[PDB]
Amino acid sequence: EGEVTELTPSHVIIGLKTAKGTKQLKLDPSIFESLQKERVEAGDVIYIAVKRQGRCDTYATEFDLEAEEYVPLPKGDVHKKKEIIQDVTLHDLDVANARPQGGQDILSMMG
Amino acid sequence: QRIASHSHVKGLGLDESGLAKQAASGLVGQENAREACGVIVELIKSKKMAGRAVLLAGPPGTGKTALALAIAQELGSKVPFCPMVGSEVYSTEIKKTEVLMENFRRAIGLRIKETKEVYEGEVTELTPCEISHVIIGLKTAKGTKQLKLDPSIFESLQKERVEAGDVIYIEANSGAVKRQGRCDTYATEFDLEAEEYVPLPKGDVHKKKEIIQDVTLHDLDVANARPQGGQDILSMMGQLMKPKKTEITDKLRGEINKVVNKYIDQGIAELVPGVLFVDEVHMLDIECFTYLHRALESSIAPIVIFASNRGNCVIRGTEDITSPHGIPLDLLDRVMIIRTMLYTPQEMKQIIKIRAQTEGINISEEALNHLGEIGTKTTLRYSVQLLTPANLLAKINGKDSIEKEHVEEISELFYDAKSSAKILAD
Amino acid sequence: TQRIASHSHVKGLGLDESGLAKQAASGLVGQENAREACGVIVELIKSKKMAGRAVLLAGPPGTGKTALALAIAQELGSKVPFCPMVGSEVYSTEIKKTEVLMENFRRAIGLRIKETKEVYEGEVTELTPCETENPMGGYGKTISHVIIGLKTAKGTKQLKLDPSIFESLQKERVEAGDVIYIEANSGAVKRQGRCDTYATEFDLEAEEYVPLPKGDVHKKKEIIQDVTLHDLDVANARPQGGQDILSMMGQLMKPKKTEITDKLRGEINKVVNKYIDQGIAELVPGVLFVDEVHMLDIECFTYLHRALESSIAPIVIFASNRGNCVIRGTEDITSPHGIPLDLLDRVMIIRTMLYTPQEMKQIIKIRAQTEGINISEEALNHLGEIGTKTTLRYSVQLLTPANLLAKINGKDSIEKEHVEEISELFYDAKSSAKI
Amino acid sequence: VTRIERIGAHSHIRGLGLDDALEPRQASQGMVGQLAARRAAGVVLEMIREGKIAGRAVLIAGQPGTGKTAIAMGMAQALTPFTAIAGSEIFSLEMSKTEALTQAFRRSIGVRIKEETEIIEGEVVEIQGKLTLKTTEMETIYDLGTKMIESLTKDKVQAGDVITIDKATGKISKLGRSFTRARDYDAMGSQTKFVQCPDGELQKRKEVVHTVSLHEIDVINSRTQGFLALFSGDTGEIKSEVREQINAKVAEWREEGKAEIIPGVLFIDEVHMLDIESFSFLNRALESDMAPVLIMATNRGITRIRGTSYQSPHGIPIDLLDRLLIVSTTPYSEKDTKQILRIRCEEEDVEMSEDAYTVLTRIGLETSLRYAIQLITAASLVCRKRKGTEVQVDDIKRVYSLFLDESRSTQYMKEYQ
Amino acid sequence: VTRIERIGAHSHIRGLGLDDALEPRQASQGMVGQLAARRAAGVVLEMIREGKIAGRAVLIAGQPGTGKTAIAMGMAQALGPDTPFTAIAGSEIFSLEMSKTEALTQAFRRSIGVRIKEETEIIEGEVVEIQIDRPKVGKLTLKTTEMETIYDLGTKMIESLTDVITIDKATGKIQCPDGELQKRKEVVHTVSLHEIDVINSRTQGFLALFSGDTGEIKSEVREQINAKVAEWREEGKAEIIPGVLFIDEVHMLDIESFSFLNRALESDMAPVLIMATNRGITRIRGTSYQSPHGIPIDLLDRLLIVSTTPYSEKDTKQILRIRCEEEDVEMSEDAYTVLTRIGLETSLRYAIQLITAASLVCRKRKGTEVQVDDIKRVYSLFLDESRSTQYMKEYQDAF
Amino acid sequence: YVAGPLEYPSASLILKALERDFWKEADLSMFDLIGLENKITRHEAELLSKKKIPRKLQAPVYGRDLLRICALPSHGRVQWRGSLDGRRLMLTLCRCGESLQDVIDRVAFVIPPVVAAPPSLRVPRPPPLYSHRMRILR
């Protein structure tokens, strides 16, 4: 998580900035975002297998009226690992592996 | 070889004069049905008639399916033979009539005579000139030359990721494929590329051979029931229903018949009508019999062999109409009925001996007598089934052949339909 | 190709100004009370005041229930829609019965939608009169108006349009000498193509040159489009525009006729009412003629006697031919006309008596006339006699074959001998019952 | 040489042999007996040819093996769209009985459409911005617009290519170069086949007639048309798209002469198996304007109607029986049986003796006729086995002893397994 | 701790209690009685293992609760892995996406295995942060504890170097591994004729693990695959192995399924069809014909019947003790006698239910060993089928 | 939960189970789908404009080449391409019970559930990967 400072590109060397520090991640091309996901001033949170554009960086003072809404700079470190004790049923895994919806290959999306 | 229930049946057993021998080609007795089979097999080999039907009627365990397999073997693999079952008609994604028509079409085969030649060449010599004209080099183990190709072949080639030192096959009319490496990819010591290599091919640079591909009308129908691929229409994913619901006859099957007749008149194709063996015919519905007695009347219907095990009973789907052989009188007529008779105890013992010889089991004289007695007691199939575990136990006990003790023990161990019903009264 | 159908002589109920019945009732003869009831119900339909009303054309076979049905349909005219349906069509393997019934009800209802659009067209002569920069700000170069010289076949008329449209002009290839399709309110420019006057015979191109517009530059095109409510339902059901709908495998199965009540009712009804009360459309409820109603399952009648309760349901004309018979889908549940006794209470029964032998003769004669073949007095009398003996529909079918036999025999009119020979060559089922 | 179609069950009848005045002959076009039924078939055939009316159905009745299907096939061969189906074909899992029956009805009608368009064709000499199109009798230069320039590149048009372009910028490169094929010694492309240079005027208008059935609803059914025209196609066939669009368009084409309809024939063999739903639907479908002439065949007398416990003549409802002209056949006699057996032997290339013919006729009288029709070829094959030149009584007797008939089969069922 | 394969009804059995000569035992491998049926099961198991004969079928008849399915599960366990054993019920064929006949002929496909051996070369290695991202041939530091090979590779191989770098015939794949980097690994894969489905379409292994595939292409992909796997046989490419198809409660099949099985067992690759039925004289489904076991005679004659006699007091208590050993229950001899009585009276499965409930009650009351009072209170709490039937007099919403 | 893909190990000969010998696949010209590129009028034109046998444009090899190149063009057929081309309101709805609202807002407001545990797609793992299947997939 953190405000995107650089988005220069297969592999994309993205730059996330947070209250703690800045880190240049060597992210894979599979995470390359299709929608707007502005190269700068865009707040993004990613986890390993989809990205979520939380909101725009707190530049509310740059313009008096802008369509984008703003959220504060994330205070947590860029790279963080959290253990989640999720409760699921076996049929969930069954039906998921039956017709998976992950991945990025075009064949998957067409299926 | 995994001996099956009808392995010893390697033929029909007719002599030169046409009469059926007492015991030959794996079959025993049943001279009348064997003569009828040897007549209908010649009818089929004539290739002049169409839609003629046959019915191998008779009590159970009389070898009607054995006679059908004997006919199939005598005909040879050069003509199609479609083993079919009544229950198979009850499809979920295709209507019964359509499944029956597809089986009928499968029962017809045609051989396509064609002389194809290749133009294998070296890629390292690739040197186009003008995109309008291109030249490729030839270097095989027996000769080296060069060819001149239409730029379309060059496009189809560059479409593939060709590389210097690869073996590419170029057909004279259309198509092209790549074979990577010619004893030069492993030489540079570069690691694998998810594919296996191959040395340079032997023979002349230009090869020509006669081709004969046995294809049936159903294959043509299935191929024409799809866009053939190519452009964006090539979209194909899992669950694709290749056996589509139905295919119209006038505008699709008719065109197939027309093109086949044209290519036959041109001498390129040769038709070879097959046989459609529908077992358990009584399982078909009356709405299936009514269409069957009409489809076999067409000028393109092949020879259809039938086999009704059970006798007179209520027809399927009616619940009130009863007809002999479980077939309506409408379809029963016009179908040559071949009655199969029961086997005698001596014939049963001879069939048991033939089965033992084919499957490799060795039985003694008294053992053969006891097994034939157990067979004629309930049915021959019970003895045929007990034959194997008898020799199995013999081997377990250290005996090479089967004796009275082993056959009696295995008969007491297992039980038959008659014995089971006798004890089922409890 | 005239392609005379089975019974096309019927042109209308043929009721007098007073509403009574006559013999020569525009093709249909006899059935005085039935035709009077048909007139009453067609007057009802024309009133367009009541909805969800059903009528039953009960009567023995051969009474011409379908005949009078088509007669009342023609009387209604092509203006109001008329959707004919048979009970067998309700049985669908992809869509449930009740939804097919609702779709048919929607089809029976019509809706005329008008659309007036003020559009300007003609050969363009673009020119921007230079104007002083925005007077509120500083100086420079601006454009306060953009004049377009639309030239039509009748003359020329320059339009001083708003300058903001200049973006649209530059967007499309709007060059001096082409036909543009201007819109009054929207203003969007849609170039039709260059003028044919410049289409030199040596220029190889198509769909690019169009003829000059005929008439004044300013044209107020008024167009009316009549589409049933079911058409709007289907149009709003499936999607359109991108979204990877171009796929073949997973999308070619267009038969998704399954429909929900939320979309059918609710929003569609509201937008229809908005177009009605606003002056953009006019509702036109039609009629749903359902013959062989006895063929429907009880699950169909139980939904019919609930849909007829709705205010939007159109007029339904049931035509049952069978008598007291067990309702389909029920266990030996005998009801009159093969219809549950509960639905018969919601339908007006129009009884149709059997045709008098004189009426049989009249029908045979008028059918022969419609066919265009002359028949002698003796031949017509024999036809009437045989139609009295067996079903009447057998006689009318003996006209064309007898006509052809006569024409092949060298004679024009159908002589008694011809009909006598055809009666032995072809006969009815009553005589065929002798197995 | 063996072909797809060969001698079958109804191939001996080349047509409905009739005179100019519809006087059935004894036996001319392979068909014999059934004089009244033959004259009725000829009358209904003339009615079909006339096309003056619509919605006429004929029921062919008679006992099994009386030549009903034979008369139907003879009428079909003498009759030009023809659609022969059975009661089980309309029964589809993905299409309701009504939908399949409507599809069959619409496919039983033909429609001819005349198309006239301007065509420009000639060998391309060189392009560019402008085309230089050559033909045998002249050559012309054409200026290329943006669309033409784009089509010249999306399709690799080049010198020598015999191009073709009508209006609507619909360019076509039918086949490749003419002379340049020489330097293409070894390999020749799949689509790059060669053609002769065209002649005559460069630009020429060609009038062509397109023959299609009224079942074209499938063409206007979905976004893709050619795909559904091969396999089952679409199953919905919405009533609107069928009636409000196709029928109106055909009527407008008839008015303006763009198209002309030709009503065919719909032969539903073994109609007795149809359900009451199909009969109730037909009751109305036969009332429509564009309704073809319907023909039926049934071997049932007083039997139950499938789908209900009711019984009626021919196993069909009375509502429909009042709409059909019943043409019952008569069982063949000794002379008619012998003559049809003679015709079958002549068609199957089988020669038999007079005593053989007499015995075969006696069998066909004591048993069914198809039994003897099969005994013909069976005894022929037996004689071929014996290498004889003509089939004698011994062969037919041997076959009669080998292959059993319904009667003898049932009589020998005393075993009861 | 808690695994998926928890303690079940047929979990106590872990094999077939036979000697070298297929001689049954009184108590071994969780098997107590059914000596004749156990010997027949062993004989048919050895026959299956031979694999030289094809197209045979067997039927395990007997009253409910007489070890019908226990013998089948014991045979399955004795067969061990490496041999397909398709265990299904008579209700599985009734599928919607596929016809019942197609479902059955596909279940047959799941009962025939084929072993294929692939010889490939796999290289060792370890990830040391090779193939850095954005921040030519490159560099590959291939090294092993036994011997190192520091060399480079082409451009299409440096981008697939990356903890253990197990490079194989593919485009690369992932303490440092020991031994020479070049190592020949012979891997053998066993598939149950998956070629018919694994080569049905594109992206079809998806279907092989989804069953979304509708009725297979009849006589177009099943016969060609059979011919090709036969060509593989006798040429050293592959060899087929016959499995077993167990259809529990086969009486649910209809006349169509029986007629199809009649001829499905007459093919070269026909597996051994073992079946089981509790019903006796019963009408065949779809018809009114009353036949023994609900199976037609034309099929019963094609198979061997295997009867299972009921258990006695000795065998009853021995099976009870075996189940106790399987579970963690312990009781006194008096409790054993009482439970054996209750079982021989009502049923063995109900006796196992009662002993489980008694162990639970004992654990609840802080007891260490179940007693007679525990099982008595259990029987009082949990009623028997026959017991509840007697109380049916209350007329609780009859039909 | 992001569950890992289920590896499906399988033999390599499995993927080569429907491949036929290159010297046995004959040229099947029975494909009637050629009606997507040819017309009936153009079909007739080609038939009426087929080059003759002489074709006056190593000697025996060249003669055989000319013969084989004359044999193939003789094949001509078409089902229909011209007859197909020769023949030919999106109102706003609320999609719910709310009075008036942007459909985008409707869809964006109510999205509680997310997939429980969607994994990636299954991947067969035959240690040998035949060039044919990989090329077709690429």
Ligand SMILES: Nc1ncnc2c1ncn2[C@@H]1O[C@H](COP(=O)(O)OP(=O)(O)O)[C@@H](O)[C@H]1O
């Ligand atoms: N004439 C014969 N000679 C030798 N064996 C025979 C003969 N007829 C039948 N059999 C054997 O008897 C068995 C009967 O099998 P099948 O033909 O299926 O019986 P059905 O007559 O019920 O079809 C076959 O396995 C076959 O091996």
Ligand SMILES: Nc1ncnc2c1ncn2[C@@H]1O[C@H](COP(=O)(O)OP(=O)(O)O)[C@@H](O)[C@H]1O
């Ligand atoms: N009053 C009438 N005048 C003229 N023709 C009639 C009359 N009544 C019935 N017909 C004829 O009867 C035939 C069919 O009648 P129809 O409406 O189908 O009655 P039903 O449906 O009860 O059989 C039509 O072809 C029509 O020509």
Ligand SMILES: Nc1ncnc2c1ncn2[C@@H]1O[C@H](COP(=O)(O)OP(=O)(O)O)[C@@H](O)[C@H]1O
């Ligand atoms: N008049 C006839 N002329 C020629 N062949 C006939 C004649 N009548 C019957 N046949 C022959 O009888 C055979 C079977 O008759 P079929 O048409 O099945 O009777 P049905 O009309 O009851 O179905 C056909 O193969 C046909 O060749």
Ligand SMILES: Nc1ncnc2c1ncn2[C@@H]1O[C@H](COP(=O)(O)OP(=O)(O)O)[C@@H](O)[C@H]1O
């Ligand atoms: N000889 C035996 N040895 C061990 N356990 C047995 C034996 N016979 C039966 N059982 C057990 O007794 C119960 C009998 O049920 P089972 O035979 O599976 O019923 P069915 O076969 O009718 O479904 C099962 O729990 C089984 O494990």
